[PDB]
Amino acid sequence: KLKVVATNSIIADITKNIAGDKIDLHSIVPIGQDPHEYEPLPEDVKKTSEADLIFYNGINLETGGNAWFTKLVENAKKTENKDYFAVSDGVDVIYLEGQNEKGKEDPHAWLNLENGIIFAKNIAKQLSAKDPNNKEFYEKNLKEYTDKLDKLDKESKDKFNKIPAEKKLIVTSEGAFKYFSKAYGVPSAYIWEINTEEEGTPEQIKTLVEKLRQTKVPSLFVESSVDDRPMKTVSQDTNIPIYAQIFTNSIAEQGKEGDSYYSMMKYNLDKIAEGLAK
Numbered sequence: 001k002l003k004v005v006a007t008n009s010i011i012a013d014i015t016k017n018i019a020g021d022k023i024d025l026h027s028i029v030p031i032g033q034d035p036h037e038y039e040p041l042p043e044d045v046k047k048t049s050e051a052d053l054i055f056y057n058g059i060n061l062e063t064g065g066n067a068w069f070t071k072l073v074e075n076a077k078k079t080e081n082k083d084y085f086a087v088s089d090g091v092d093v094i095y096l097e098g099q100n101e102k103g104k105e106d107p108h109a110w111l112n113l114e115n116g117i118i119f120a121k122n123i124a125k126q127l128s129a130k131d132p133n134n135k136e137f138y139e140k141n142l143k144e145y146t147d148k149l150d151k152l153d154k155e156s157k158d159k160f161n162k163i164p165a166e167k168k169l170i171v172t173s174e175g176a177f178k179y180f181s182k183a184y185g186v187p188s189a190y191i192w193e194i195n196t197e198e199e200g201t202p203e204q205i206k207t208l209v210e211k212l213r214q215t216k217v218p219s220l221f222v223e224s225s226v227d228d229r230p231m232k233t234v235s236q237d238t239n240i241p242i243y244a245q246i247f248t249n250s251i252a253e254q255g256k257e258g259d260s261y262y263s264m265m266k267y268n269l270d271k272i273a274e275g276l277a278k
Contacts, residue, residue: 002131005044005051007062007069008035009251010110011087011119013261015055017145018124022134026051028072032225032250037066048076051083053130055123058086059093061107064195085126087119094178096194106194108176108249112183113153113265117146148262153183156269160184160276166216167276171208171234173200173226176248180268186276189217191230200230209237219243219275225250243275 001024006012012027019025026047029035035057040048048054054073056062062069078084094106109115124142128135160168168186170177175190189211191204198204212220217240222231224245235242246268252258258267 002127003047003050003052004127005048005054007054007056008249010249010261010264011055011057011123013251014087014116014120014145015123015127017261018120018138018141019127019134020137020141022131022137023127029250031253034225035061035249036064038062038068039066040068040072045072045075048072048078051076051078053126054078054084055087055126056084057107057109058088059091059105059107059109060103064103085122087122088115089122090118091115091179092182094182106178108194109179110261111177111180111248111265111268113149113156114183115179116261116265117149120145120149145262149265152262152266152269156273157184159273160186163273163276167218167278169215169217169276170272171212171217171220171240172246172248173223173228173231174248176223184269186272189215191234200227205230205233205237208234212238212240217276218278221246221272221275223248243278244271246271 004023004025006015006027008029009027009031028040028044029038056069073084088109091109096104096106120142124138127138169189170181170186171189173191175188175193177188181188191208192199220231220235220240220242222228222242222245225248231242247258247264251260251264258264
């Protein structure tokens with residue numbers, strides 16, 4: 001079987017939906033862990049050395065700070081666009097502070113389903129190139145999977161489009177939902193920007209509170225992977241309830257709600273459409 005390495009649970013789950021039992025798959029960042037500053041363990045080093053195909057997010061998810069993915073592939077002697085591939089190739093990239101330059105890409109592309117589809121298409125392309133005997137199988141799985149994501153995308157867009165515009169704001173701790181905002185027409189507000197060293201200061205909280213007092217947003221949200229005390233303070237100060245915990249950069253543990261890329265996005269989209277229609 002083709003030996004495949006995925007850098008996180010989202011990419012691994014999309015890969016499973018395309019490849020089924022045709023591959024030997026290993027994931028690096030486990031469910032619920034952080035890709036930023038992740039430290040690969042010996043099993044990751046050995047699996048990456050042995051891999052026929054490696055999928056990573058790209059757009060600065062795993063290559064900033066400690067740049068763990070760069071170190072991994074260089075030590076494994078793996079080559080870009082031969083052995084390893086960025087599944088985000090083709091996304092309409094968003095840049096931090098709207099400054100188009102290398103290293104300022106916002107990595108959170110998968111938080112809209114159009115980009116999850118692009119991820120799946122890139123994964124199917126490279127599986128087919130390395131394992132042509134299973135090309136038709138990968139293509140069939142791809143079409144079924146992208147149809148499923150597209151149906152959820154269209155249904156969710158129709159729900160957001162009906163909400164009174166004054167209610168439409170996605171409020172989270174970190175500004176990690178800009179791709180979600182672009183696709184779904186729901187502007188973002190947040191406590192701290194991506195790549196902020198000091199998270200949840202009294203000053204950051206007060207500035208979001210003052211913004212939210214001039215809106216009619218009916219619900220706030222909080223990421224399941226962040227310390228919720230800053231958003232709980234924003235909620236207390238605005239008297240706007242936190243409607244739900246939402247997923248950001250991982251699927252859920254197996255057997256729980258949100259334990260796949262599809263179900264993680266369905267959960268997020270269902271909770272945010274419900275919470276903003278309140």
